[PDB]
Amino acid sequence: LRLPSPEVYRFVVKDSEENIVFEDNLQSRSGIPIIKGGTVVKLIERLTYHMYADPNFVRTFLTTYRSFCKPQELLSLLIERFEIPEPEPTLKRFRKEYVQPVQLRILNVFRHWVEHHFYDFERDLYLLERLESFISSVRGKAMKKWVESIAKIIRRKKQAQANITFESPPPPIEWHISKPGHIETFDLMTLHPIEIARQLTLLESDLYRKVQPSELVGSVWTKEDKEINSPNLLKMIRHTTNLTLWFEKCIVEAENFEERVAVLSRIIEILQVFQDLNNFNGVLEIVSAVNSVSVYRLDHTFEALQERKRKILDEAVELSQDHFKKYLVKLKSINPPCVPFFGIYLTNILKTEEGNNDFLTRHGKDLINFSKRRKVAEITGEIQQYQNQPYCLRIEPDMRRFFENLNPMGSASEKEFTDYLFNKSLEIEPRNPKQPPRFPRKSTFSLKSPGIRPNTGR
Ligand SMILES: NCc1ccc(S(N)(=O)=O)cc1
Secondary structure, X not given: OOOOOOOOOHHHOOOOOOOEEEOOOOOOOOOOOXXXXXXHHHHHHHHOOOXXXXXXXXXXXXXXXXXXXXXXXXHHHHHHHHOOOOOOOOOHHHHHHHHHHHHHHHHHHHHHHHHHXXXXXXXXXXXXXXXXXXXXXXXXXXXXXXXXXXXXXXXXXXXXXXXXXXXXXXXXXXXXXXXOOOHHHOOOOOOOHHHHHHHHHHHHHHHHHOOOHHHOHHHHHHOOOHHXXXXXXXXXXXXXXHHHHHHHHHXXXXXXXXXXXXXXXXXHHHHHHHHHOOEHHHHHHHHHHHOOHHHHOOHHXXXXXXXXXXXXXXXXXXXXXXXXXXXXXXXXXXXXXXEOOOXXXXXHHHHHHHHXXXXXXXXXXXXXXXXXXXXXXHHHHHHHOOOOOOOOOOOOHHHHHHHHOOXXXXXXXXXXXXXXXXXXXXXXXXXXXXXXXXXXXXXXXXXXXOOOOOOOOO
């Protein structure tokens, strides 16, 4: 009874379809009403509601909010929420049934915020200055525990900001023609295919484990705030592009037909080791390379593959068909560790982003579509389940450095570079029915694969 005037406290404007929308269905009957959308004011209100706790909304909100609210603005709204004015009189119930419950719900939000999304503060020291200054100003007797708990989390995050443990013997590193410390001799064909697969899998596992759901929500990696909203996603996308184009480049620049067949075969071996390692990211990067317009059209090179190499490629390619029907089946059947195919989460998020309005309307004046953010958090959520299981393989630092530095494009555009691959493809297997032209090798190394049975393994 008796809140302050909406005129001095924007959160207590009356609930109407002007400001807030709930799901009206059989699920929303029992218990905590389910939010479909509202003004950001109204969503903040319900994020810190006096009448009940809402752990599920707090989790979804803090995962998704960056698609509709800046971190600086969220802090401003939680402080605005916190600074609750006195009701209009002619306080004791107001203070214990409204204020204290609301202020604890705010401090609970801050606690989830610094616990699970401290990257927001790592990305913006000013954001953290504002949070530290505000939290240190809270002198409420019952607030004390919460304030201490938030301080302890910030201390732990700052520590680990400044400050690999094998649970079983990892396999011995495999060497082919390229020997350790000879990084200048590192090529697709001089490195061991087993170790190429292992070190790309370690690189790709590391890139994949660093991606936060929030880097995907509201397709933020394509918007202009992407380098800050999606740094880990964009490293992973740039990796995929560089490795996919490196495989294409290795195939199409092998002018000598025998060499090119040996190169395509070696790639397919690498694909088999990716499959053994449940690195489906790796599998579908190679699939991506071999269905590329510049490599797809090399009918003579494909034809000359051993039927067994052909078979492994066909099975891999089929994982991708019918909207990755078989990949999705395979992914649910394997034992981690694994690197999921990252592309399909991007695709399925673009479809969900594109297909749902960011807003319910402009008649209520920016009613945020929250249910849209819930559906995307279900997709980003699936990412999480394979991020907590590391590979029992050893880093080969110079191989790691080679693969981290892959730059097939050089200074050219993606476009300039894919035009080049295509002009090269037409040169090496022209659009005529004559046998493929016969070019000399420029490389001297044996074409012979050591295969994908471990050698030093034993
Ligand atoms: N050059 C014919 C050709 C290219 C590539 C494939 S695939 N999709 O990689 O199995 C199949 C045939």
